[PDB]
Ligand binder design. Structure first.
Ligand SMILES: O[C@@H]1[C@@H](O)[C@H](O[C@@H]2CO[C@@H](O[C@@H]3CO[C@@H](O)[C@H](O)[C@H]3O)[C@H](O)[C@H]2O)OC[C@H]1O
Ligand SMILES: [Cl-]
Ligand SMILES: [Cl-]
Ligand SMILES: [Cl-]
Ligand SMILES: [Cl-]
Ligand SMILES: [Cl-]
Ligand code: NA
Length: 194
């Protein structure tokens, strides 16, 4: 097992991982065998951590385990595109705060209905440094921890709603995210190209 407490990306037991924190409170990620990781956080500022793939794509993502936010946290298939720069989220679980934005319609996927939203961040941290970019959101209408995410269903719905992804030149991870919160997660990811 390897504990991560400091910003970095890399590979562990055949899986890509990303850890990122603004440095508030206490945040750790433990990288275990195959696709397993755990997180522990107390009074965090903002962090995103998880395992997945060096590049995004159309992938049937299978995951399982636990996700226990006290306050604001997300469980999301998460990644970035280039040209345009986009931060994208397929959110299966959350805490006290449900992600919202400009409502674009729904998509049905993996036993659930997802609300689609677009938001925009100005001069914020990104995989290209301090940048302005849109965020694309699929938010499940009912919370869960575990199952399949057919990323194709989301990407295609986004495209029908005029939300175009760039190139899959950056990571795609099954992410734990917290904001001014405490919690834990213990997750396993796997997947294959549709
Ligand atoms: O060390 C470099 C990092 O600074 C950089 O990491 C990305 C920075 O932005 C992170 O996304 C934020 C997460 O919180 C959301 O609410 C915000 O909208 C985002 O700003 C992302 O997780 C990191 O990968 O990338 C390059 C690194 O070398
Ligand atoms: Cl649902
Ligand atoms: Cl916005
Ligand atoms: Cl500017
Ligand atoms: Cl749960
Ligand atoms: Cl499912
Ligand atoms: Na658009």
């Amino acid at each position: 097992a390897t504990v991560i407490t400091t910003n970095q990306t890399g590979t562990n037991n055949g899986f890509y991982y990303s850890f990122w924190t603004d440095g508030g409170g206490s945040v750790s990620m433990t990288l275990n065998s195959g696709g397993n990781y755990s997180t522990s956080w107390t009074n965090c500022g903002n962090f995103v951590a998880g395992k997945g793939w060096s590049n995004g794509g159309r992938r049937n993502v299978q995951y399982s385990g636990s996700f226990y936010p006290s306050g604001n946290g997300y469980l999301a298939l998460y990644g970035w595109t280039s040209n345009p720069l986009v931060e994208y989220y397929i959110v299966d679980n959350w805490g006290n705060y449900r992600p919202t934005g400009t409502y674009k319609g729904t998509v049905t996927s993996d036993g659930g209905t997802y609300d689609v939203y677009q938001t925009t961040r100005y001069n914020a941290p990104s995989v290209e440094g301090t940048k302005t970019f849109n965020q694309y959101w699929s938010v499940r209408q009912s919370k869960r921890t575990g199952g399949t995410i057919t990323t194709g269903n989301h990407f295609d719905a986004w495209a029908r709603y005029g939300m175009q992804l760039g190139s899959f030149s950056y990571y795609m991870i099954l992410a734990t995210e917290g904001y001014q919160s405490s919690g834990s997660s213990n997750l396993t990811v796997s997947g294959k190209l549709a």
